[PDB]
Each structure stands twice: as structure tokens, then as C-alpha cells.
Amino acid sequence: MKDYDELLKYYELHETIGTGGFAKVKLACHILTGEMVAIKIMDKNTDLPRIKTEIEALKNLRHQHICQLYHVLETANKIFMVLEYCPGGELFDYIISQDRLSEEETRVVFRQIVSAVAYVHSQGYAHRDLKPENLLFDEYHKLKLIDFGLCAGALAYAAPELIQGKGSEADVWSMGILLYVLMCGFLPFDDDTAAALVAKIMRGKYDVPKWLSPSSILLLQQMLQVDPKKRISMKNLLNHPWIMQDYNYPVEWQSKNPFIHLDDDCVTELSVHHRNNRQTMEDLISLWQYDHLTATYLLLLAKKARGKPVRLR
């Protein structure tokens, strides 16, 4: 197949592992690094603006809690997105397998969600589709935010002002719904029709189960404010008393994953693969075209970060 010729120069394709925005996701191996990847396969003959908004957000976003874009390939009838492999499943799966999570367990997970969304917002974006299906665990059981198809969703996770049509404050409401579903195992607003769900969201009344601590209840009232001018700010969420209870330091949201600083060990290994001198290699890396080069650089950087040698072939 001519649709897979350029792909298979770079990647050893494995089995179907899932789904991403109606696109199939397959396991693969990046050949040069030996590193495992997720490949999202789009058919461009069978939601094209959604694909392009995602790609363009993922080109500008780079963070420890955002599932990394490595490589975009485009053929006759296909778009391939080479992404960070998350074998740990969805946060959805995790919620439904236990009944809910304990307060201590959802702090661990929720501090990662806060980190990622605080970073998204600092870049001038709102994700506009925060939900547990859209968070995946990596090999180290750390959350990675996916689905950037809406940018700057599920009705149950949508803010009041969003349903009215009257942008980053709506994400805080969506993290509130998330906080609740984690500790409860059910949504705070749920109905059999869309109009009854909408009316529930507009009222802002929800059950407070017995097992919820007063600290949990306070944070939920601050995030699940129907008035977005009354909603908790990102600033005050970061060092909220609930957020800092077992970790007496605020959420570190700032990216540890740069666009500007280049790892010298990776540049010298890329130079020996390419047969060239630095500054030709750095200038090439710094272009960030989301081609085989950025894939290999970022996966060499991920190889180095797991302790394994910063080596190619």
C-alpha cells in the first residue's frame, strides 16, 4: 500500500490499541530510537477542521502532562499523527474499575490535571473538552491530556455560560465536574434528555454524598460556581488548601519540556547520525517541522530521560 510507504520507513507498525477522534490508534515502534509510539490514523475521505486545530495546538503545546506530538505525515488518503505512548488507559477506566477514588487518590491525579490546564491557559488556549476519557496514563502512571480538536464538548462537563453562548473559566467548571466524578463515581448533573441536563446545570444544584470531606465540598463549591465571575481562579486553584493538603507546595504547572533549550547529548547523537556539524543540526532541530527529525530528537530526549543510552539505530 502506497498509503503506508513513508510511514513504514520510520515506524514498525503493531496492533490497534484504541481510538482518537474517530481515528484508529495503533501501537508502533520508532525504528531509529527503538521507542514505542501511538499512531493516530485519519482517513481524509471518510471532521477535517478538528484534525487541523488539534495538530496546530499540539505544535505549540509541549508539557509533561500533555500527550506529545512527535510527527505528522500526510499522504493521498491519510493523516498520521505520531504521539506519546500512554499504555495506562483512560482516567475513565480507572474511575469505573474502583467505584470512585479516595480523596488522597484524586489529589494525586487532580494536581496533574491542574498542572496541564494551567499550562494550556498560559499559552492562550482553553481545551474546551475536559473529561476523563481525554486523560490517559503513561508508563509511569502519570496523566497526559489528549483531544485538542476544540481550542482557543460533553454536555455534562460544559459550563453554564458555555451552554448560553456567553473562555478559560469554563475549563475550571469542567475540572470541578471532573473532581466530583473522581470522588463520587457519578456526575453531579445527569439526565436522560439534553434539556433536563441543561436545566440541572443552570440551577447548579448537586448532591453532596456522605463520604465527601468538608475540604472536598468547599473546593467543589468554588469550582462549581454557576457565575464564572464567582468561580475560583487558576491562581487560587494552584495553592488551594485542598490542593496542598498532603504536599505542602503548590502545583508546578510550568513546562519542563522546552522548545528553545536543546539537549547537547541528543544534538551530538543526531550530528553523528546525520554526518554534520552543530548549528546546522541545531538550526535543523529548532525549525520544529514535526517531521522524522523532531520525532527522533524528542524520542532521543525521552530515551535519555528513562536512563537508557542517548543512542540511534
Add this chain to the structure above:
Amino acid sequence: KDYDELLKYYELHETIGTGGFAKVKLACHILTGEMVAIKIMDKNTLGSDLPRIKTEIEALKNLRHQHICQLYHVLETANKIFMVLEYCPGGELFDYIISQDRLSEEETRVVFRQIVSAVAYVHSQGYAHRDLKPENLLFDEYHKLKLIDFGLCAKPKGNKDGALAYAAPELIQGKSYLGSEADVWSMGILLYVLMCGFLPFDDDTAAALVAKIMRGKYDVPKWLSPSSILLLQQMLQVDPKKRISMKNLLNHPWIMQDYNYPVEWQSKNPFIHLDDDCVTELSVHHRNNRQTISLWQYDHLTATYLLLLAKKARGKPVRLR
């Protein structure tokens, strides 16, 4: 929830894949303990693909075959359609093709006789699949093919309603067809990609692919046996009236080679002849009498009966907790 009625019957596991444009999850059927694939359709998200879901469900209600991935249970809620299906952990025929060089003729025959079986059964039921491709064939846990994705299936003689490389000439132009001849073309495309590792008609644009399909001219690689070449010419006839019939495909010499018996296409999976170890265990658990199951509503009863029948076929006890 959206998941309240589902979770009475199934223990949900992880996301394993995609069916059409919908999530597939691993699950366990609580009563029988048997593993299951659950296709999840969001009702107010997919919209324009709702008639595709209903065409699949209605075909899968009327098709029951050893080489068709089995429908157990349809659940419909507020914002969801669940299809509970036969678990196929062996991956796609696509994966098998892309993992190695071309298959040997003998490897192809093994696999291709199963494709013929399934499609001859589909056609005997008055259907045409219309989307035959190696992504729509899955291996079960004993490495046997199961036909999937009936969203574009049609009754060619009934009431009215794929991949371009697999599409028949008359299908790209839209002719007055008995519709099942287009599936024979697609199996010929399949036969070629299996023995060659590449498609007989392939281009960088859709218009150049279409024109190649209309001409009907393709390379015959050196490694292809004369037997293979003959069968390919019979199936890859551009005139659907000149294409090999299902009848002559079933006992074709290439097909018969090494096996020396024709493809057995008729279903070993009945709607009528109930194996009553299942009926008697369905009578003890569900406290009522043996005057049936035969309604086949694709509810929890259909699922449990068919999975009990599967659990018996595995050797495991005919038991309902």
C-alpha cells in the same frame, strides 16, 4: 449514568479499538464470565452516521455464522447505543499482511477460504457487504477470521439504502446491479494484496486510482503461480457479468488445491436448533419453564444464551452464577 443498565450485565475493561467511528472496549459478561467486545455509539455526537449503525444492527440480527463476528446484545440509553459483540483478540488481517512480506499461496488459501465462506453466507441471505477490506476481517483467539463492519451492507434485491482501492468498476460509476458481483471483485483485490503485498490498482490521487480500476490492467508479479493468475483474471473482470459467480468460486480449482473439498459456507450457528444444556441452565437460573430464547430480541437473554453456547463450545461448564 448512561452505564447503569450495561453495568448490571457487563464488567467493563479497557479501550481496545475502533468500529466505524466508535470506541470498542473489552468487557466481561457477568453471568457466563465470557469476554466480550463492546462498541459504544454516542447518540447526539455521530448524527449523520446513525443510519449506518441501524443498517449494521439489522444485518447482524439476520446473520449468524462461524466467520461473522457475532452480535450478542443491543442496549440503547439516553445518549448511547451499545453493541455487545464476539471478542476477537487476534487483530486484523491488515496487521498480518503488513507484518511480513506477501503471504505464500498456501497461507493465502487458509485465510481466503474463510473470507469466501463468510461472503457466500452473506450473499445467500440476500445481502452484499460492500466494504470488504483487510481492516474488516479480525482473527478470533483460535486464529479464525470474523467479518466485521456491516454499516455499508445492502440488500441488492431488497429495499434501497467503501475503500476506493477495493471498489468494483460498476460501484464507482453506480450501475443497475444485483450488487453481490461487486463483493467478488473486492475478494479478488484481497486475494492479490495477500499474495503480492501491494494493491493491483494504486495511485497518489483518487482520480488516477479510479481510471486504473476502469481499465482493469494490473501487474502479474513473477512469484504468482499460473493457478493464482487464472483465479485473479476471473475475479478481477471489469464487466460484473463476466466475473466468476459465487457458485464457481466455491469449488474453483485454486480453492480446491490441497483441501480437495469445496468451501463450506453454510452456517454452523443456528436460529432454530437450540442446544438445550443452555436451555436447562437458563431454566434453573432464570426461574421459569422450557417453552423458550426463540424471540431473538438481542437483549440480555440472547447474550447469555449465545455466550453460554460459546462457553460450552470452549469445553468450560454450562453454568450461570
